[PDB]
Amino acid sequence: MASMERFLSVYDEVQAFLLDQLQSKYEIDPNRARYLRIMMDTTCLGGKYFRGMTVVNVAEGFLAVTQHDEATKERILHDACVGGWMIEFLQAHYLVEDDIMDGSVMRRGKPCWYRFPGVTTQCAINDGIILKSWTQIMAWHYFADRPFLKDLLCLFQKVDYATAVGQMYDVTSMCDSNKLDPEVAQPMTTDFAEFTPAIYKRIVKYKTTFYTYLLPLVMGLLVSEAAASVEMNLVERVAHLIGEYFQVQDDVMDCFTPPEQLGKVGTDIEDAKCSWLAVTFLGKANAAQVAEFKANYGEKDPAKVAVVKRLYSKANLQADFAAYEAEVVREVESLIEQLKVKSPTFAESVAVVWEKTHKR
């Protein structure tokens, strides 16, 4: 059976399981079950399933080189799918809540969930809660007797936490740290002294890399009982490097990809986000250019946004981007080589993850 169709079958299974359990144990009625079904589909489906499918991919790599009964190959692949959906549902949680937090309008060419007329923020915040609660319901049900249950739950838990810490780093990235104070409304930075490479790296490391690259890789190892085929410090490094690159692309796109293609009208300039463009701009701008940036960044006014965009074009940031990209290629290749020593198989799965990121 092909991987994607397995993964999709498992979604239907897990959905039926969750909703049947709501009826049998949580006294749900059919209309609220239907609400929850449509919520799950709307918030969890229609992406590429990169994250979830990486768990499957890593597991399939191990299957090709490890002796097992047929029934065992099926159980490991089922487990990789369940694990993958846990990650997809965890992403869904974060997208729901993030869209609410940021006042976002569209996601993937459709309205954000909270903007559906029969949802509202009042419901959507709780829907997002339920999304994440479902990951735990899946794990305890499907992995109950599994030897990896504890390590998988513990991993999941620390990635979830890292992610929430990252969202805090992200939403506070345009304030001056020394002025954070729950009692005082927060001004936007005027000096941009915290728009640095190291600060940027911290945001991206926590907000995206743990759930997008580390969790799918390591879940794949855990469902395969293969976490001793690898040096976990090397897996973390490679996950953090690739994930950083991913976000650097995401930041460039937010500014320069046409809305209809991006699935989104990008607002990072208006939201005064610590983006890779802003940091790299401030890394090479002269005094005049910096002053112009400060007078126009983080403002709704489309004239001001078009000034900041003009500044970025004339700063030849694509040349800085090529250069970053070259360095990441080289470092990713070095880490893959290091991984080849213990597991050529796992190294190849990392190679695939990198090709998919690097090409998209």
Next chain:
Amino acid sequence: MASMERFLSVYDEVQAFLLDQLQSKYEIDPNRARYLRIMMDTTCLGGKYFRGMTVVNVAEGFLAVTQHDEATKERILHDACVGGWMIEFLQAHYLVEDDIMDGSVMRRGKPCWYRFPGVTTQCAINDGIILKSWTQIMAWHYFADRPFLKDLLCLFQKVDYATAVGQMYDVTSMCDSNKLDPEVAQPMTTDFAEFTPAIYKRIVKYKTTFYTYLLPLVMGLLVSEAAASVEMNLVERVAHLIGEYFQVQDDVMDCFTPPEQLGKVGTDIEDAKCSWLAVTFLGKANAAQVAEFKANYGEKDPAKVAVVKRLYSKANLQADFAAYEAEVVREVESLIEQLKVKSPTFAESVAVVWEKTHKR
């Protein structure tokens, strides 16, 4: 050492642990650590710690009748405190997010967290996420080698889920079920056919009783390794009964307790909530009175709210309340007796929980 001061010491310990770990492992800076410290204090402290202290109370009951080394008595009490704070932090999560969802103004005589000037909803939603993530960080750290870890995590997880399911039942309680639809903005019910005792019971059972009464009771059993001193079906029943009573008091107070004493301006009438007053009103009203209720319920207009309040007074709902109260006393007493057969000790802890609820 007295229980409350143990419990409070443990808060300071757990706080220091969480924030030190943010600095050592999550690259946090001191100002964001300070934000998070003040968030934790503001959202987790200043209540009565009923829930958290029930874990301690149950554990202390078992200590009085079980042979143990001194060091073991201290470890079980430490564990009961950690467990108790998990519940308190879980409540804190739900209050933060609930206040945002419901557009609430005050909580305990202070502004809701999201309303602090330097917080905002954008941050507060994520703060609430972090609150709940901290419960898992505590559990894995403090209970890592404990035999009850799995059962405690599994229990916690199903209570958290039940709670979120209950919030969905609550916020949708004024819509007609057959009209729920993410695509269609939701009208308030005109018939109030879903304002029934059984529907009310379902809301309250899920939204409050699992985290307020069941979780503290059963956590106390688990940290004491005493879950075989009891018939778990009886613990659930008694928890659901007392919890229902608790909420019935909460609903009456929302209408009739002066704001400054309630720590809150109650808005259940305006929010068209399925409250015990509304259900009991509609259970005894004549046609004229029902028509007057339908013309005035769920409306911001203070004249209309004062009409619904007038209807409730002249319907002599305090007499219905006395009668409910009498029935609950009798049923709670029956369950306590049933519990006395296996554990007089646990029965007494339940007796205390009931006295604290019944008297407040």
